[PDB]
């Protein structure tokens, strides 16, 4: 049972900035078994990044992910108007899987 | 307090592809038997493997190899290029009975000789499907305005020889030993081998002849069961024999058309003119269809009516059962077998026609001309499978009609390579160990 | 592509059972795939309920002996169906349930780690609100 | 057991039959001739590309040869009981699949420094 | 530095990066481009096995810097240990020992020979 | 005015798919591809 902590809780940015979201686990996941999901408010969730630093077919190259010991970070550059939603960091190393806490990105 | 140790020879394999070579044990043949090398199975435990027979690479490689082997024996012998002349064909009658008049014609035509400025008026016997009329009536060959006719080579044989596509060193072949395997999914009984068993390259549509049998029950295989455009493969558990024969003598006559160029045609028939026919047992076919429909009712429901009808229409090599017996290509109507309706000592005789101009592998531009065979032709064969299809209904009834189909030669070879997989061995490994150098 | 539909909004009384279905379109066989069922409480985080892999259905350590997952293979006149039954529900089960699939064909795909895996395709989610 | 017979055992139970898989890695212009020639060329190249990597690190003729590099704790924090008795070879290569290049890089310069340190030993 | 990056340096600075050049000497129809790839692969096998066979008869198989018990003659070179490794390079040292290369290649063959099992076998 | 005698309308006999039949067809050629033989005859 690994508890995930996401940072920050609620932040705001503008069109053209870079949003950095961090995720800290309990133990040391040395195998990079982490994933970053995006869920719009009201719509269905969407998997963005699997295995920490690998993209999916249909995801643009502006997103980036990095892993270092416990700290898994996600950088979103060239921010648009359609990337406002909730972001989740979820591990699948040990049974069972546990999600993060939620991080909403507003516009201001 | 930990160090790195390199291990060589770990049992780790990846998924890849390579090239396979023939291996057989040993008048020539079409497929090169004397060019192959002269010809163990280790069971594995605590390992699973996900097999998929519809995404294999061995079927396309085998198809390309059979196509490349078919076009290597037709080259160095004689081609029949000056045969496109104006024929004069009449009917033939020599104590001939009913339902045969109209299938054979006696043709006469001019032909060049070994001298350039001379001619020779010769005659032969042709079939109905080999000549067409143009507007005594004049006739011509059917494959003349679209393809070039070359003769089949008289020193080769079309007998199928079992070969072994065998992998070199560095790769491995895995095989699923499940008795109720359906070609898709995980297999808990995987064993490694060197290479496969004897596969006979039998070219036939709608009837898997001289194939491999099942173990427990009749197997049904399909890719997309919710689509009406995918074929359905049926694998029996018992063989149903069938005896095909041709009562004609079919004497041969050699005509020299030039310098070192010979042409073998049909001469005169000594005897009666009867139909070539295949006899199949009637008592075994009913229980064969019952064992087929007992496994086929599991995919549609226990309240389904199963109708068995014949083919609708299309090409002659699709609707009719096309095969090769004794060196001669037979096309059987086979409409009397698939005629039934299943609700929830006699023998059937099927007449077959003979064609001499064969267009193989669905090609447009490369024809052939088989030579006549002297004597009486009689062969026996097994029936170890079926290729069926269904039509699109109005999704409201419980009646399903199944019709035989084919034409694509990949389905005839996918039923034998549905359990084998090719893997690539990687023997390097890195392990932690409390040890130091020197 | 691969499209999944689910049931509608069903309102149930405490004490009875409920059954949520999930129909798939595009998958080949459940032996090459794995069907995971999670949920999401309104105003809270997600929660993993159960999964079916290699024809072996299981649940978590908190929903043991309470839920039941079932699945069938292809049918010539029916889509692939995955059902989940909840018996003896409490007053704290109002959530948006989902239905996810994950392809477990390749061993070196990196999307699965010895039974537990990620979610590549999501559904629409059914709202279940229980009240007295 | 045979060829690939210990594929389902643990890492400690499969490290004793390494000589079985180490000996089965080497052994008119028709259609069946060029395929056999390309297969022999591919087998020779696949043997040489592994023998060169075995000869760079200094393990010419040894299978359980020892190195001098230390094991970093960021690669795998497991002990000797959860590796040689629980995990297999099909999972251990996928566990550290992102850290093989730095290990292959560290196995070269240490062997080079060990070979260049031997030159200052016999010069006394 | 890279592949052939120390070609302009001296013999003392280019003898430390031998691992760069020690890993770049090794790596379907009958058309005009299908036979050239097979010819290049066969030539790459031939130009590696011939160079590896010479190190096997000298007892230096698997070693980049290997030295034996062959005494260096004073008639091959009359230089010191400071005017060779610090002044001359590898492109100029090969031109001076071109008339004495086969003598060293023949003396290196018997060395790994006069060091074989004798009667100790009985 | 610069392409008065460049193109040539030619007619010729040619064999067909039947060995004992001929055909009379036409073509349009350039002046650099045909030479006269001493309308006129060209080859
Ligand atoms: C190629 O060939 C392949 C051959 O290998 C072939 O594979 C075969 O595919 C078929 C598919 O057609 C497979 O058949 C199915 O198999 C399913 C497997 O189910 C497994 O799991 C259940 C559940 O286990 C839990 O519960 C039991 C009992 O409590 C416990 O003991 C367990 O430990 C476990 O509990 C854990 O999990 C809990 C959480 O759920 C935890 O709380 C708990 O703590 C535990 O951790 C088992 O019961 C099954 O066992 C049965 O099968 C084994 C097989 O050996 C028997 O030995 C055993 O005695 C049992 O009989 C099994 O292990 C089946 O679930 C599935 O059943 C459905 O179909 C049948 C009819 O065929 C129905 O009778 C059945 O009721 C199911 O139908 C329901 O679901 C469908 C789908 O929605 C509905 O449409 C249907 O209406 C029905 O719903 C109704 O009932 C529901 C309750 O069940 C109810 O909720 C609904 O509301 C509704 O009323 C079916 O049999 C077959 O197994 C494969 N063969 C294999 C794997 O070898 C492949 O397909 C071929 N491919 C092609 C392309 O041809
Ligand atoms: C096997 O053979 C089939 C037949 O050709 C191939 O094609 C698949 O066909 C099914 C048919 O159902 C496709 O399934 C999809 O189901 C969706 C859900 O249907 C319900 O909801 C709609 C309203 O949205 C109702 O009208 C309907 O009655 C049901 O109640 C449908 O919505 C899909 O239609 C459209 O959906 C979206 C728009 O919402 C579009 O993006 C889609 O492209 C589509 O136009 C559709 O009917 C299934 O998607 C088809 N597959 C593919 C890949 O397209 C199978 O592909 C084939 N199997 C394989 C493995 O190839
Ligand atoms: C396939 O089955 C058919 C019948 O179902 C077989 O045809 C039968 O062949 C026999 C032997 O050729 C015929 O017998 C003959 O009878 C005449 C008249 O009595 C006699 O003079 C002959 O000496 C011979 O005995 C029989 O009439 C004939 N039946 C029919 C209906 O035509 C056929 O031979 C079978 N083919 C094979 C390969 O088994
Ligand atoms: C399926 O396999 C069977 C068994 O091999 C094949 O039957 C065999 O067919 C060949 C070809 O006609 C027969 O060879 C010929 O035999 C006659 C007999 O008189 C001989 O005169 C010829 O010179 C030639 O050798 C062979 O005898 C026959 N085998 C048996 C046991 O009858 C069958 O052809 C295969 N099916 C297909 C579609 O190829
Ligand atoms: C660890 O390695 C795996 C594969 O060895 C990496 O997964 C690939 O990452 C690339 C990077 O964009 C993707 O394009 C591929 O689709 C991924 N999958 C495969 C199967 O190749 C993974 O990113 C690595 N993790 C790191 C570098 O942190
Ligand atoms: C096909 O037609 C030719 C003539 O066009 C037939 O040849 C003649 O046959 C009769 C009958 O015995 C002989 O009297 C003639 O001398 C033959 N003429 C020549 C030029 O040979 C031939 O018999 C016919 N074939 C069949 C099977 O009836
Ligand atoms: C073979 O060639 C002969 C000529 O050597 C053809 O005979 C001529 O046919 C034409 C067409 O009707 C007649 O007009 C001539 O009178 C015939 N005789 C001569 C001497 O030219 C004959 O038709 C050709 N074909 C066959 C099948 O014999
Ligand atoms: C197909 O031919 C085989 C032999 O070529 C037939 O088998 C023989 O049938 C007769 C008549 O029933 C028996 O007396 C023999 O004992 C059978 N065996 C042998 C070895 O001769 C077979 O019956 C034929 N099948 C059909 C449907 O006619
Ligand atoms: C294949 O067999 C079927 C069924 O016997 C034939 O269909 C009918 O056959 C009878 C013969 O008694 C004819 O009188 C009918 O006209 C046929 N129906 C048609 C043509 O629609 C079928 O003709 C046979 N195939 C061939 C090529 O003869
Ligand atoms: C047609 O089926 C029969 C019945 O299985 C085959 O006869 C067996 O052939 C195998 C070898 O393929 C022998 O080991 C058996 O002894 C044979 N007899 C029995 C009773 O099983 C026959 O070989 C099949 N025909 C072809 C061409 O393979
Ligand atoms: C067809 O065109 C050619 C090329 O233009 C003509 O040949 C020349 O015509 C001019 C015009 O009278 C003469 O002055 C030249 O002397 C001709 N050249 C030669 C080499 O004779 C030709 O006259 C044209 N023919 C017709 C019938 O218009
Ligand atoms: C094509 O063939 C015809 C044959 O019909 C040729 O026409 C003959 O040409 C010669 C030479 O000028 C004349 O003597 C004849 O009178 C023509 N007619 C016949 C019926 O023989 C014609 O010349 C050929 N060439 C072309 C280009 O048409
Ligand atoms: C060029 O030659 C072609 C022949 O290939 C001429 O076409 C014929 O013209 C006559 C006269 O109008 C028609 O009666 C024929 O029907 C045409 N076709 C054939 C096949 O003979 C054409 O007129 C010539 N001139 C030009 C300017 O194209
Ligand atoms: C020759 O056979 C054809 C085809 O059966 C038939 O139409 C024609 O009437 C026959 N002619 C004679 C003279 O028998
Ligand atoms: C060739 O002739 C046959 C028979 O008349 C005809 O069906 C076919 O369409 C012809 N093909 C071409 C290309 O003219
Ligand atoms: C075929 O004809 C030959 C003579 O050319 C004869 O010897 C043989 O018996 C005939 N075959 C039969 C009647 O089956
Ligand atoms: C259909 O009938 C068979 C007869 O043995 C039975 O085994 C099977 O369970 C039936 N199918 C269903 C869905 O009940
Ligand atoms: C199929 O059977 C029907 C009914 O006898 C017949 O009319 C039709 O011609 C048959 N089709 C073929 C291709 O034989
Ligand atoms: C097909 O079956 C029906 C029903 O028994 C029968 O009347 C008909 O004659 C059969 N047709 C053939 C060609 O056997
Ligand atoms: C497979 O596992 C069982 C127990 O899990 C063990 O007894 C057996 O030795 C294993 N097989 C091999 C080949 O190691
Ligand atoms: C271990 O990894 C850390 C972080 O990348 C690195 O700073 C350190 O040098 C490594 N140590 C060893 C012994 O490889
Ligand atoms: C080239 O010569 C300069 C001296 O001017 C020296 O500093 C440099 O290191 C030399 N380059 C190499 C690659 O040794």
Interatomic CA distance for residues B209 and B232, integer angstroms: 16
Range of the domain at D44: 4-122
Interatomic CA distance for residues A94 and A69, integer angstroms: 16
Resolution of the determined structure in angstroms stands at 3.7
Of all protein residues, whose CA lies closest to atom 1 belonging to ligand 5? D98
Longest dimension (CA), chain B: 103
Instruction: Identify which of D27, D43, D71 has the shortest CB distance to residue B432.
Output: D71
The DSSP-derived string for B153-203 is PTT-------B--B--TTEEEEEE--TT--SEEEES-EEEESB---B----
* R_g of chain B computed on alpha carbons: 27
User: Which tokens is E122 given?
Assistant: 């009985």
Pocket lined around ligand 9, Cβ cut-off 6 Å? B 333, 335
User: Which tokens is B429 given?
Assistant: 């490994």
Cβ contact, residue pair F20, B85, below 8 Å: yes
Cβ contact, residue pair D90, C107, below 8 Å: yes
- Give the ligand with the smallest distance to the CA of F31: 11
Strands B305-308 and B399-404: parallel
Q: Report CA(B194)–ligand 20 centroid distance (Å).
A: 24
Cβ contact, residue pair D56, E18, below 8 Å: no
User: Which tokens is C84 given?
Assistant: 């989940």
Interatomic CA distance for residues B178 and B53, integer angstroms: 14
Of all protein residues, whose CA lies closest to atom 34 belonging to ligand 2? C3
User: Which tokens is D92 given?
Assistant: 């251990």
Q: Report CA(B339)–ligand 9 centroid distance (Å).
A: 13
Residue B58 phi, psi (nearest 5): -75, -25
Residue (of C129, C125, C130) closest to C7 by Cα position:
C125
Residue E121 phi, psi (nearest 5): -65, -40
User: Which tokens is C82 given?
Assistant: 């995955």
- Strand arrangement of the beta sheet that strand A103-107 belongs to: A10-13, A103-107, A86-91, A34-39, A45-50, A54-55
Interatomic CA distance for residues B139 and B122, integer angstroms: 15
Residue D21 phi, psi (nearest 5): -80, -15
- Indicate the SS3 state at residue B64: helix
Strands B347-354 and B328-332: antiparallel
Q: Report CA(B333)–ligand 18 centroid distance (Å).
A: 9
Is the link from the previous residue into A96 a cis peptide, with omega within 30 of 0?
yes
Residue (of B400, B402, B401, B220) closest to B303 by Cα position:
B400
User: Which tokens is A14 given?
Assistant: 């503008």
User: Which tokens is D53 given?
Assistant: 């990597």
Interatomic CA distance for residues B42 and B47, integer angstroms: 13
User: Which tokens is B34 given?
Assistant: 């004397």
**Which residues are registered as beta bridge partners of B349?**
B279
Strands C10-12 and C126-130: parallel
Give C8→chain A minimum CA distance, Å: 15
The DSSP-derived string for A36-101 is EEEE-TTS-EEEEEETTTEE-TT--TTEEEEEETTEEEEEE-S--SS--SEEEEEE-SSSS-B---
Alpha helices in B71-131 (DSSP H): none
All structural domains of chain C:
3-130 (2.60.40.10)
Q: Report CA(B413)–ligand 10 centroid distance (Å).
A: 20
Alpha helices in D25-99 (DSSP H): 31-57, 89-95
Share in percent of chain D as helix, strand, coil (round to 5): 45, 5, 50
Chain F CA closest to residue B110: F20
**Are residues D2 and B40 in contact, defined by beta-carbon separation less than 8 angstroms?**
yes
Q: Report CA(B375)–ligand 16 centroid distance (Å).
A: 7
Distances D100 to B3, B102, B432, E23 between C-alpha atoms, Å: 15, 77, 13, 18
- Total structural domains within chain D: 1
All structural domains of chain A:
5-107 (2.60.40.10)
Contacts of B227 (CB under 8 A, 6+ apart): none
Cβ contact, residue pair D60, E62, below 8 Å: yes
Specify the length of chain D in residues: 124
Contacts of E1 (CB under 8 A, 6+ apart): E17, E20
Interatomic CA distance for residues B222 and B200, integer angstroms: 23
Residue (of B203, B230, B222, B211) closest to B409 by Cα position:
B203
Of all protein residues, whose CA lies closest to atom 6 belonging to ligand 20? D9
Cβ contact, residue pair A32, D98, below 8 Å: yes
**Are residues A86 and A39 in contact, defined by beta-carbon separation less than 8 angstroms?**
yes
**Are residues D104 and B23 in contact, defined by beta-carbon separation less than 8 angstroms?**
no
Q: Compute CA E80 distance to the chain's CA centroid, rounded to the nearest angstrom.
A: 22
Residue (of C96, C106, C123) closest to C35 by Cα position:
C123
**Are residues D32 and B36 in contact, defined by beta-carbon separation less than 8 angstroms?**
yes
Residue (of F18, F1, A1, F25) closest to F9 by Cα position:
F25
Interatomic CA distance for residues A28 and A43, integer angstroms: 33
Interatomic CA distance for residues B410 and D69, integer angstroms: 54
Locate the domains of chain B by residue range: 4-432
Residue A68 phi, psi (nearest 5): -150, 100
Cβ-count burial of E111 within 10 angstroms (0-12 exposed, 13-18 middle, 19+ buried)?
Answer: middle
Cβ-count burial of B394 within 10 angstroms (0-12 exposed, 13-18 middle, 19+ buried)?
Answer: exposed
Instruction: Identify which of B6, B19, B69 has the shortest CB distance to residue D38.
Output: B19
Interatomic CA distance for residues B59 and B49, integer angstroms: 20
> How is residue B106 annotated by DSSP?
E
Q: Report CA(D15)–ligand 21 centroid distance (Å).
A: 28
- Indicate the SS3 state at residue F34: coil
**Are residues B356 and B373 in contact, defined by beta-carbon separation less than 8 angstroms?**
no
Cβ contact, residue pair F20, B145, below 8 Å: no
Any chains having at least 3 CB pairs less than 8 A from chain A are C, D
**Are residues D15 and D88 in contact, defined by beta-carbon separation less than 8 angstroms?**
no
Contacts of B363 (CB under 8 A, 6+ apart): none
- Give the ligand with the smallest distance to the CA of B405: 18
Give D43→chain B minimum CA distance, Å: 6
Cβ contact, residue pair A99, C45, below 8 Å: yes
Residue (of C41, B311, E41) closest to D39 by Cα position:
E41
Strands C67-71 and C10-12: unpaired
Breaks in chain F (C–N beyond 2.5 Å) sit after 38
Q: Compute CA A23 distance to the chain's CA centroid, rounded to the nearest angstrom.
A: 8
The DSSP-derived string for chain C is --EEEE---EEE-TTSEEEEEEEEES---TTSEEEEEEEE-TTS-EEEEEEEETTEEEE-SSSTTTEEEEE---BTTB--EEEEEEES--SS--EEE--EEEE---TTSSSEETTEE--SB----EEEEE--
Quick check: CB of C77 below 6 Å from ligand 2?
no
Residue C93 phi, psi (nearest 5): -125, 15
Q: Which residue has the tokens 């549509």?
A: B205
Cβ-count burial of C63 within 10 angstroms (0-12 exposed, 13-18 middle, 19+ buried)?
Answer: middle
Q: Which of B286, B307, B309, B339 to mutate to test the pocket of ligand 19 (most atoms within 8 A of CB)?
A: B339
Q: Residues E26, B169, D11, CA angle at the centre, nearest 5°?
A: 95
Contacts of B145 (CB under 8 A, 6+ apart): F17
Query: Angle, nearest 10°, between helix axes B58-70 and D31-57?
Result: 140
**Which residues are registered as beta bridge partners of C24?**
C4
- Indicate the SS3 state at residue E63: coil
Is the link from the previous residue into A8 a cis peptide, with omega within 30 of 0?
yes
State whether the Cα torsion B197-B202-B208-B210 is positive or negative.
negative
Residue (of C99, C104, C98, C130) closest to C117 by Cα position:
C104
Do chain E and chain F touch with ≥3 beta carbon pairs under 8 Å?
no
> What is the CATH topology of the domain spanning B4-432?
HIV Envelope Protein Gp120; Chain G (2.170.40)
Contacts of C28 (CB under 8 A, 6+ apart): B184, B223, C74
Q: Provide the Cα torsion E102, E107, E108, E109; round to 10°.
A: 100
Give the Cβ contact number of residue B94 at 10 Å: 11
Give C116→chain D minimum CA distance, Å: 14
* Atom of ligand 6 lying closest to residue B94 CA: 28
Interatomic CA distance for residues D36 and D38, integer angstroms: 5
Cβ contact, residue pair A30, D75, below 8 Å: yes
Q: How many CA atoms lie within 13 A of B398 on its CB side?
A: 10
Experimental method: cryo-EM
Element (H, E) at B127: strand B119-127
Contacts of B108 (CB under 8 A, 6+ apart): B87, B88, B89, B121, B122, B123, B124
Interatomic CA distance for residues C53 and C115, integer angstroms: 7
D56 and chain B: CB distance < 8 Å anywhere?
no
Cβ-count burial of B146 within 10 angstroms (0-12 exposed, 13-18 middle, 19+ buried)?
Answer: exposed
Contacts of B120 (CB under 8 A, 6+ apart): B110, B111, B112, B113
Interatomic CA distance for residues E57 and E118, integer angstroms: 18
């Amino acid at each position: 049972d690994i508890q995930m902590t996401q940072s920050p809780s609620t932040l705001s940015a503008s069109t053209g900035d870079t949003v950095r979201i961090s995720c800290r686990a309990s133990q040391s996941i040395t195998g990079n078994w982490v994933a970053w999901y995006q869920q719009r408010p009201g719509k269905a969730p969407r998997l963005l990044i699997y295995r920490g630093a690998a993209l999916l077919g249909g995801v643009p190259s502006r997103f980036r992910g990095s892993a270092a010991g416990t700290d898994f970070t996600l950088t979103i550059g060239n921010l648009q108007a359609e990337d406002f939603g909730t972001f989740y960091c979820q591990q699948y190393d040990t049974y069972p899987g546990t999600f993060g806490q939620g991080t909403k990105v507003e516009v201001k | 307090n930990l160090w790195v140790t390199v291990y060589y020879g770990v049992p780790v394999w990846k998924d890849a592809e390579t090239t396979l070579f023939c291996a057989s044990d040993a008048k020539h043949n079409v497929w090169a038997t004397h060019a192959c090398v002269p010809t163990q199975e280790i069971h594995l435990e605590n390992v699973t493997e996900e097999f998929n027979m519809w995404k294999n690479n061995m079927v396309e490689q085998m198809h390309t190899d059979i196509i490349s082997l078919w076009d290597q024996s037709l080259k160095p012998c004689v081609k029949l290029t000056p045969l496109c002349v104006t024929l004069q064909c009449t009917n033939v009658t020599n104590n001939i009975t009913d339902d045969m008049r109209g299938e054979l014609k006696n043709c006469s035509f001019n032909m060049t000789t070994e001298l350039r400025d001379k001619k020779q008026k010769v005659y032969s016997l042709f079939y109905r499907l080999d000549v067409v009329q143009i507007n005594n009536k004049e006739y011509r060959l059917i494959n003349c305005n679209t393809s070039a006719i070359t003769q089949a080579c008289p020193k080769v044989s079309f007998e199928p020889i079992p070969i072994h596509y065998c992998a070199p060193a560095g790769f491995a072949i895995l095989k699923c030993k499940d008795k109720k395997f359906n070609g898709t999914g995980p297999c808990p009984s995987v064993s490694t081998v060197q290479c496969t068993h004897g596969i006979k390259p039998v070219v036939s549509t709608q009837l898997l002849l001289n194939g491999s049998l099942a173990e427990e029950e009749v197997m049904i295989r399909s890719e997309n069961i919710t689509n009406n455009a995918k074929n359905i493969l049926v694998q029996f558990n018992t063989p149903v024999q069938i005896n095909c024969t041709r009562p004609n003598n079919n004497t041969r006559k050699s005509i020299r058309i030039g310098p070192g160029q010979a042409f073998y045609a049909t001469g005169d028939i000594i005897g009666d003119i009867r139909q070539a026919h295949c006899n199949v047992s009637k008592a075994t076919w009913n229980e064969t269809l019952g064992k087929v429909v007992k496994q086929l009712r599991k995919h549609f429901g226990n309240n389904t009516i199963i109708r068995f009808a014949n083919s609708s229409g299309g090409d002659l090599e699709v609707t009719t059962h096309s095969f090769n017996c004794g060196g001669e290509f037979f096309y059987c109507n086979t409409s009397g077998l698939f005629n039934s309706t299943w609700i929830s000592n006699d023998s059937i005789t099927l007449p077959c026609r003979i064609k001499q101009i064969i267009n193989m592998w669905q090609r447009i531009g490369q024809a052939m001309y088989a030579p006549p065979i002297q004597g009486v032709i009689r062969c026996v064969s097994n029936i170890t499978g079926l290729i069926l299809t269904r039509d699109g209904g109005s999704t409201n009834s419980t009646t399903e009609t199944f019709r035989p189909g084919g034409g694509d030669m990949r389905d005839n070879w996918r039923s034998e390579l549905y359990k084998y997989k090719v893997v690539k061995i990687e023997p390097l490994g890195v392990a932690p160990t409390r040890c130091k150098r020197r | 592509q691969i499209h999944l539909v689910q049931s509608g909004t069903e309102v149930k009384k405490p004490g009875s059972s409920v059954t949520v279905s999930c129909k798939a379109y595009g998958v080949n066989t459940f032996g090459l795939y794995a069907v995971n069922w999670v949920r999401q409480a309104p105003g809270q985080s997600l929660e993993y309920i159960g999964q079916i892999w290699r024809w072996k259905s299981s649940a978590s350590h908190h929903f043991r002996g309470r839920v039941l997952i079932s699945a069938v293979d292809l049918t010539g006149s029916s889509p692939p169906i995955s059902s989940l039954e909840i018996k003896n529900l409490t007053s704290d089960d109002t959530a948006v349930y989902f239905c996810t699939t994950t392809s477990t064909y390749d061993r070196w795909s990196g999307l699965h780690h010895d039974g537990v895996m990620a979610f590549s395709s999501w559904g629409q989610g059914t709202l279940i609100s229980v009240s007295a | 057991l045979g060829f690939l017979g210990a594929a389902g055992s643990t890492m400690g139970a499969a490290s004793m039959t390494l000589t079985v898989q180490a000996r089965n890695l080497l052994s008119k212009l028709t259609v069946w001739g060029i395929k056999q020639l390309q297969a022999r060329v591919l087998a020779v190249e696949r043997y040489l590309r592994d023998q060169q990597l075995l000869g760079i690190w200094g393990c010419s003729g040894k299978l359980i040869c020892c190195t001098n590099v230390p094991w970093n704790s960021s690669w795998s924090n497991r002990n000797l009981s959860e590796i040689w008795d629980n995990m297999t070879w099909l999972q251990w290569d996928k566990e550290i699949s992102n850290y093989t290049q730095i290990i292959y890089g560290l196995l070269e310069e240490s062997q080079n420094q060990q070979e260049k340190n031997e030159q200052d030993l016999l010069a006394l």
